[PDB]
Amino acid sequence: NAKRIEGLDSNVWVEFTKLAADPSVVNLGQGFPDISPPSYVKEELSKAAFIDNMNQYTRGFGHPALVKALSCLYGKIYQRQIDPNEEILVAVGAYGSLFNSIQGLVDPGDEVIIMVPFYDCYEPMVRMAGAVPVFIPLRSKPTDGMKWTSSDWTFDPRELESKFSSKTKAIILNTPHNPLGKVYTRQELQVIADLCVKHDTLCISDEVYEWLVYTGHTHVKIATLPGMWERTITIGSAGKTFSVTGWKLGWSIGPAHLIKHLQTVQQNSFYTCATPLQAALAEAFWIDIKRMDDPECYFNSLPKELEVKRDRMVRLLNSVGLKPIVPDGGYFIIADVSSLGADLSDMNSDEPYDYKFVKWMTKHKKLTAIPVSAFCDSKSKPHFEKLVRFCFIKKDSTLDAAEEIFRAWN
Template identity: 30%
Template sequence: MQPLSRKCDLFTDSVIRRMTRISLDCGAINLAQGFPDFDPPKAMLDRLAEVAYQGPHQYPITMGAPNFRAALARKCGRFMGRTLNPDTEMVVTIGSTEAMVDTLFALTNPGDKVVMFSPYFENYRAQAIFADCEPVFVPLTPPAFNFDANVLEDAFKQGAKAIIICNPSNPSGKVFTEAELKQIAELCIKYDVYAIMDEVYEHIVYEGHKHTYMNSIPGMWERTVSCSSLSKTYSITGWRLGYAIAPKEIMDKIKQYHDFNAVGAASPLMEAAIVGLDMPDSYYEEFGAHYAHMKKLFTEGLDRIGIPYTDPQGAYFVLADIGPFMKPGQSDVEFCEQMARKVGVAAVPGTSFFKENVNNIVRLHFAKVDETLNEALERLSKIREKMG
């Protein structure tokens, strides 16, 4: 038999999704894979019930159903502060993951360098490998996860074609300030680099911080692709409705890859999701307050237990230091697998996110109802005795 793809030897399966499988196997509370255990907005569920009988149930237009794109343009345009053309400047994808992959293929050629900050969402490195690109990592320094502008410029000087930025960041919870984005924008313009933005947590930002869209920075609309999804904003991670927004010249290329990669997103789910996109501003205010409550409950619990962590500025993750609870020579992967089985709480080992040699950090998420978080904290309170 001829050898299989060599690319698959350059990365493993998703450790995040692997931890979900371990959770299911041993009955652990899954604080590894970031999905909520509460329902989407009732209006969306009611509309989904209607669509089940009314349709549509057949192929949509490849770029996304026209009425869905129109609603998406209204919603995104409102928050981005610009008028978006739903026909030429956006495409609906199978989650933001597909949007990111299509964008990488549309912008890059084999051998191109792609800058990304570390810690990074594990998908990015694998996606760069798919596209035959070389990742160039720039460290973010905890606890605020700031970057050194000189180190970033050195990465650009290596001949970067694009930079991937998750804002707010998974896994660190960093929210890039407008000043930081302007610094990055200046480098993008100076070195002719595209910005690929993963903005799925755009509406989960905590007090004292503000989300700024990169495409709103002067000179950046022309070279920015904004990738996002409805997954987090409306608690529908399983609906897999994502999108990319970019100027027409870039979007034409993204659509080409999307057409042959996925054909189209799910027709009935797009139809049902329109009511969510038309939610008033009060929805996003209540949504943000809900996440602020969950963050407070969970982080105060970690404080009581004595588990060190970095305080997130946005998104719904904490990076916790499990060094005090590890055995000599134990890897973070081994620790997480044992913690799921012995403590009953699943986390993601930090080596999934860091380019640097980090072995004492895990990612936990708190997008859960109070009962789930309280039970998880109760289990974590016994981490010393059960992992000793």
């Protein structure tokens, strides 16, 4: 195997799917919606499938109708003109976008800052570019009194400074955050922008859950903050925008001198994406660009729908003294499990507690989730290993089944 990939062959995120394969279990694990996508997203596929051209190659950098749509959606959010051809790159997921960003922008020996826990591909994505990932964790503050929330987690600004050096090339920001659910604040974003400008680094901002933010919170885009347009790549996703995780396209959006470089990675990698998916996506974005101010719009209705289910899931969790972190955004909830009956002394690896715990819960209670340590670097895992992550972008009947389970815990 070539050197750029030594020790990056880690899938336990296969195991977590072995686990869940047994069909009398309730899968609250991987981030797999089981609600219907919006009809008209399905309709538009079918319609693109019957148009010959749409089954043939389109533009490398993104189907013109898709980037036209994007440029006008994000145009509105940025409060500024976004240039469909030079400032957008369409890629294979947000996943490929992160890859474009890092591969196009990051060199052997460079430092990339990663806030722990992270979406798990950041790390390995950095090591493959031959760069040094540099970790700093989220830490929790005292509560309000009532609930534990996503907002109760933050970073220490001074600790953050201390991470930047002449070697820092970039920092990777994920907001809404996976797995926390944290929606960053304008104060929290301005500490990070301060340092990127102060230090002339980039920022890769992974905002695929931009629409999924709940009440009391707001998505702010660090790329809109003074000095950051020039230095930010902001990445979005079809899959999370429209609950069609299987469509795998996403977008990078930022300046031409940066999206230049992303563009060359894509050109020399896979070249182009699928045409019908993009054609149909572009229609969906249109269907939904035009009603932004209505609640019929998917950008509004979805998060309204998911908030109810978030709340139903905290309660469920609470009802066994799993200790939930009410998230501000996205569609995962994390729960401390330690106050339950530590039950695992007779499982005899040295996997972290949460792997062992999630295994136990899978065996005994018939529910799976994701151990938070999966989202952590190795020196980081012990500070996170009583934490376990559940996903709620599910249909009632699934939350029903899980309701069934939690009721009969003891």
